[PDB]
């Protein structure tokens, strides 16, 4: 229910840059205007490829995911500890007088 907003906006601009793609392909194909400002931007794009190779964000994202993952680790804690407390309850229920 979140990523479908992603999907919707991406599909909208997808229609945009796909109409772009279509009249583009026609440029090199034929009967549609020959301009030098078509792909050229595509070259800019292919040098816009994966931003920050940098190892900077590489460490940064080690940071991020380690944070959330140890969060989840603690939550391996939360889940099984709640399970454990209920177990000790029922152990104090039938094995014992809670």
């Amino acid at each position: 229910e979140h990523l479908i907003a992603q999907h919707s906006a991406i599909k909208m601009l997808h229609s945009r840059v796909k109409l772009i793609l279509e009249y583009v392909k026609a440029s090199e194909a034929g009967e549609v205007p020959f301009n030098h400002e078509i792909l050229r931007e595509a070259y800019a794009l292919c040098h816009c490829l994966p931003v920050l190779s940098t190892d900077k964000f590489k460490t940064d994202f080690y940071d991020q995911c380690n944070d959330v993952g140890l969060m989840a680790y603690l939550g391996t804690i939360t889940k099984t500890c709640n399970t454990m407390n209920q177990f000790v309850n029922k152990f104090n229920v039938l094995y014992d007088r809670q």
Binding site: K58, Y62, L94
Partner: protein, 400 residues
């Protein structure tokens, strides 16, 4: 006569109409007449399905000679019963296992060792152990074997399972069964040197309600001492919810062992020598040759570990002088086997005599980190999975 439809039961009438006879009451025989050879037509051929209840209660009136001379013949068809007729709920197959196989167990090192049953026979062993390599005294036999008998392979499959699901449930198990279980666990991960796993086995089983003391359990707590002190950089203190009389009775029985725990803080050769001579009765009581220099290893553990966070580099000749080390060249020798231990921040400077620390546990910078954590992932995953499953079954509790 005595097996008219009874052998017809095993062959034919097992998984049939009102034929629920043998399994439910849980062996080189099963009938002791002249026709002990006719004890071997078809019993370990097909399976051990729902033919459970009756005929064992019917036929517990013979109970003699469970060790007939079929040591290979009926042994052969029982290795079949392993393969061919492994069964339905094969826990109760511990019967012949109990009656015969421990019987057979008695002969194995009595001949050499378990020559002939282990490999195949684990087929119906695991047909027995339903899911988790579930606990039985088959563990007990074969793993006492792999501990002391020089045959450690067949449970290498079964090494670090969190096997569970034991059967009390009309016997089918014994206190000694788990006792042996984590016991050879301890001793083997000693010999196998995964000392932490076995130390774990000890403590997790020793908090069990305990009121009978055993010198067996004395060897248990002793070897646990061995690991927990040697294996660790200092002493462990445990969840003290173990026995009332046992854990607090052997605790003074651990007199020399608490004092030797103090000895772990002491660093004296002569005293540990004397105590080792004292307990040599245990040092070789089960071919456990080498425990003393296991202690000496813990000694140089303390040495090196102290040295670890001290400095970057010293006159390692002078450091060997420092650390009660027995040989400077020798010093780098065991240093470099620590390099084979793969842990040390040290380095090899013949010229300057330089050994530095290099403080690179991790630089948090790995797909390797990803692997560590994905391990953590799936581990904690299935952990919580059985959390929810056991919770689920707690939902199955009756009127309460």
């Amino acid at each position: 006569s005595a097996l008219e439809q009874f052998v017809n039961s095993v062959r034919q009438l097992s998984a049939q109409g009102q034929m629920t006879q043998l399994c439910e009451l849980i062996k080189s025989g099963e009938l002791l007449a002249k026709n002990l050879s006719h004890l071997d037509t078809v019993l370990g051929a097909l399976d051990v399905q729902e033919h459970s209840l009756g005929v064992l209660a019917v036929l517990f009136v013979k109970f003699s000679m469970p060790s007939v001379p079929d040591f290979e013949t009926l042994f052969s068809q029982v290795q079949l019963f392993i393969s061919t007729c492994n069964g339905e709920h094969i826990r109760y197959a511990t019967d012949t296992f109990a009656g015969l196989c421990h019987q057979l167990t008695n002969a194995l090192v009595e001949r050499k060792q378990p020559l002939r049953g282990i490999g195949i026979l684990k087929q119906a062993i695991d047909k027995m152990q339903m899911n988790t390599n579930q606990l039985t005294s088959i563990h007990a036999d074969l793993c006492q074997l792999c501990l002391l008998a020089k045959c450690f392979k067949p449970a290498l499959p079964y090494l670090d399972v969190d096997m569970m699901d034991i059967c009390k449930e009309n016997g089918a198990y014994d206190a000694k069964h788990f006792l042996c279980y984590y016991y050879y666990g301890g001793m083997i991960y000693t010999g196998l040197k995964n000392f932490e796993r076995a130390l774990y086995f000890y403590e997790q089983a020793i908090t069990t309600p305990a009121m009978a003391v055993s010198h067996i359990m004395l060897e248990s707590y002793k070897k646990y001492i061995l690991v927990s002190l040697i294996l660790l950089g200092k002493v462990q203190q445990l969840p003290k919810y173990t026995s009332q009389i046992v854990g607090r009775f052997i605790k003074p029985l651990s007199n020399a062992y608490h004092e030797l725990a103090q000895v772990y803080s002491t660093n004296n050769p002569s005293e540990l020598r004397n105590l080792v001579n004292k307990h040599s009765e245990t040092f070789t009581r089960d071919n456990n040759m080498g425990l003393v220099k296991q202690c000496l290893s813990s000694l140089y553990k303390k040495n090196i570990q102290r040295l670890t966070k001290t400095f970057l580099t010293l006159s390692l000749q002078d450091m060997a002088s420092r650390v009660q080390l027995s040989g400077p060249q020798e010093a780098e020798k065991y240093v470099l086997h620590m390099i084979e231990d793969g842990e040390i921040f040290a380095s090899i400077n013949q010229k300057d005599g330089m050994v530095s620390f290099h403080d690179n546990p991790e630089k948090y910078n790995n797909p390797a980190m990803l692997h560590n954590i994905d391990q953590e992932m799936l581990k904690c995953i299935e952990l919580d999975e059985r959390l929810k499953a056991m919770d689920q079954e707690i939902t199955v509790n009756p009127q309460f």
